[PDB]
Amino acid sequence: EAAVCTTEWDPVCGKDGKTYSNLCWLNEAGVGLDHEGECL
Ligand code: NA
Ligand code: NA
Ligand code: NA
Ligand code: NA
């Protein structure tokens, strides 16, 4: 699959309980945003 997101770490927390490295990773995955920042 095309690699479309950068590795710039500005993490967000998906509703799936996984930390995504930045919003592009989250959005490309189709996962809803829980909150900004790392999941905890
Ligand atoms: Na493929
Ligand atoms: Na990179
Ligand atoms: Na999960
Ligand atoms: Na939330």
Residue numbers in the entry: 1 to 40
Article, verbatim:
Unlike most Kazal-family serine proteinase inhibitors, where each functional domain consists of 50–60 amino acid residues with six conserved cysteines, GmSPI-2 is a single domain inhibitor of 36 residues with only four cysteines. The inhibitor exhibits high activity against subtilisin and proteinase K (proteases from Bacillus subtilis and the Tritirachium album, respectively). Residues Val12-Gly14, Thr19-Tyr20 and Leu33-Glu36 form an anti-parallel β-sheet while residues Leu23-Ala29 form the central α-helix of the characteristic Kazal-family serine proteinase inhibitor β2αβ fold. GmSPI-2 has been classified as a non-classical Kazal-family serine proteinase inhibitor group 1.
